[PDB]
From a paper:
The [name]-[name]-2 spike glycoprotein is composed of domains S1 and S2. The S1 domain contains the receptor-binding domain ([name]) that specifically binds to the cell receptor human angiotensin-converting enzyme 2 (ACE2) and some [name]-bound antibodies block the interaction between the [name] and ACE2 receptor, which lead to the neutralization of [name]-[name]-2 infection. In conclusion, we report fully human neutralizing antibodies that target non-overlapping epitopes on the [name] of [name]-[name]-2, functioning with mechanisms that involve inhibition of receptor attachment and the fusion process.
FD-5D and FD-11A represent one major class of anti-[name] neutralization antibodies, and compete with S309 and REGN10987 for [name] binding and bind [name] on the right hip 14. FD-5D makes a footprint of 880 Å2 on the [name] (670 Å2 and 211 Å2 from heavy and light chains respectively). Four CDRs, H1, H3 and Light Chain (LC) CDRs 1 and 2 (L1, L2) participate in the engagement with mainly α6-β5 loop (residues 444-452) and α1-β1 loop (residues 345-352) of the [name]. The interactions of H1 are extensive and mainly comprise hydrophobic interactions with residues 347-349 of the α1-β1 loop and N450 from the α6-β5 loop of the [name]. REGN10987 engages the epitope using all three HC CDRs whereas FD-11A uses only H3 and L1, whilst FD-5D uses 4 CDRs, 2 from each chain. FD-11A and FD-5D target the right hip of the [name] (right shoulder in the torso analogy), did not compete with REGN10933 and C121 but competed with REGN10987 10 and S309 16 for binding to the [name]. Both FD-11A and FD-5D partially inhibited the interaction of [name] with ACE2 through steric hindrance. Figure 1D shows that FI-3A, FI-1C and FD-11A completely inhibited the cell-cell fusion and FD-5D and EY-6A exhibited partially inhibitory activities. In the light of the crystal structures we can see no obvious reason why attachment of either of these Fabs should destabilize the spike.
Residue numbers in the entry:
A (entry chain H): 2 to 229
B (entry chain E): 329 to 525
C (entry chain L): 1 to 221
Amino acid sequence: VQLVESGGGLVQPGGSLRLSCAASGFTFSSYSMNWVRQAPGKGLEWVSYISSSSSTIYYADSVKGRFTISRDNAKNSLYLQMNSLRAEDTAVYYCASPGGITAAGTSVLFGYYGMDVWGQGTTVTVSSASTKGPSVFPLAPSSKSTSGGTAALGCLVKDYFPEPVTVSWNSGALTSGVHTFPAVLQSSGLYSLSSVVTVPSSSLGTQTYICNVNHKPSNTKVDKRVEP
Amino acid sequence: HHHHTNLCPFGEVFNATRFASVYAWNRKRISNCVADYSVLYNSASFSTFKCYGVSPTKLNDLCFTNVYADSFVIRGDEVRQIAPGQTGKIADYNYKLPDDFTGCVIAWNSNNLDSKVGGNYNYLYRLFRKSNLKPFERDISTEIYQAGSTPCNGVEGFNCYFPLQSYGFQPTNGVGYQPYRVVVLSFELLHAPATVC
Amino acid sequence: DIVMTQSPLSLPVTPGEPASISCRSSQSLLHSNGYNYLDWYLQKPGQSPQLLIYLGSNRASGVPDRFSGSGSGTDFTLKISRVEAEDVGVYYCMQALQTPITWTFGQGTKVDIKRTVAAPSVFIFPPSDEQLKSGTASVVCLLNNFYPREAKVQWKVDNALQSGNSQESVTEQDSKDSTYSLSSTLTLSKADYEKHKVYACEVTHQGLSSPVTKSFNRGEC
Ligand SMILES: *[C@@H]1O[C@H](CO)[C@@H](O)[C@H](O)[C@H]1NC(C)=O
Ligand SMILES: [Cl-]
Ligand SMILES: [Cl-]
């Protein structure tokens, strides 16, 4: 990897932070730079463009007057100052380099060949929500919760911030048939996921099932028994 | 998973998407990894693999205090200038090797990696300079070059040229105009008796 | 101000058989020098975007033979001769005609591994009384190991259709059986939960010859 983004993190709406993209391995001063973001679930959205000589700069309509892009060729780095942040600015921010060079005063890429170099991206989450540990509740198996010889059960990891949480079963002894779901952002601004697992219906009393929930941002480790 | 016994990832770094222009040649210190030079030397991947001051058959059983990897892109015509005591545009204004150079020059054709059908004009080379570069010197200034007679006053124009020009790397180029990637190993030996190394 | 239109939205593929994605532009992308300023990018799961095609029909560095771009002016297409497992991801097209002022992408095209249809096994979970004391009540419905992904869950509380009070989330394709799993979480205040008796989860899926309804009563076993 030849481009590396940094600086992303958690920020409250109306606030600011700066991103930095550090080039290595090639001549940073010879290529132009782009910032491209991907909102959670959504697709790719271009943000801004800076020329090689830092002389021609274009933003998109959504970020004008709020984002300012800059570069320091001596330090092989690309900067993005994000002011007046909104919640919808939450996204993974990539830096990428389009091929080609600018001539004269008119900005236009000669011998273009695409964005052949992309960074790894840095994640920015804009939310006023407060850090909170999860509340783990059990999804206990029934007999109408058993299909044709096997039974489903799980844990509900509810109301927590920020991402992520890790969930194993029996401290990793139970792996087959597990399904931890992607978290969802509730109306409150808190996250909530579910982890389920299909066990044989002949071993609800003879086998103990305990999901292990870990939320490092709050130091909260919780183990929950799931019993009928 | 990371240890000083991990072999140096030359395969990965050599295969990178982009290299540095020869005028701003990039230099890495190979450190805290095991370099098996036979895996390079016995891979028929490289067109040029010529060593100086050391026999390439005995690179693996030598002791090195410091190893440097200088990398850049030039055209196949110019690869013969990456050698001690050579002359030309590259050796004089871009990358000079010293007469007492103790190391290896590795080069290979990178047409499929660096040539673009649109034309790749982002690899540059230095064309003008007041004096020749001292060995291992690197010049990245963009001062307007004065032809020789009339002044320039730091402005471009007649007899006042920008010192850097772009290569025109397209895949339909001749082999001599095609981009070649170059890696130059610089060795510093361990002062030690024969009995140890 | 050029609108990219990719088709389809989702595209299952069999490893070893061809595949085609289409990108349509609102205006011609053929420049007066004879190049079509349109790029193709691939975003493998949990990975950065990757350049596939530049200038309409030319492969980027390292891209295998299997990939090839074509089309001119306004209708372009990608073509994988032999799709292979690792090609799973999201493919975006991008017009480059108006660089560097605007860089417009398409909607993307999610790529699945094609497999036989699989009816989701449905399981419903009442809100645990431990949660019930918090103040809220989450009823959970689980669709397990199904294909394709297109699935509709509906919550009926005393046969009344509920809307705008539940969220769902689906796992990415499993690497061994190519299936999905989907959880729908009906969240209600404890008050609203107790005032109604029959809570039903209604699942419509292609694999099911008839919609499956899983239901329960507040007091049962
Ligand atoms: C670069 O990678 C390709 C496959 O990824 C490999 O065949 C080739 O040998 C590599 N280059 C070198 C110099 O080893
Ligand atoms: Cl061109
Ligand atoms: Cl074309």
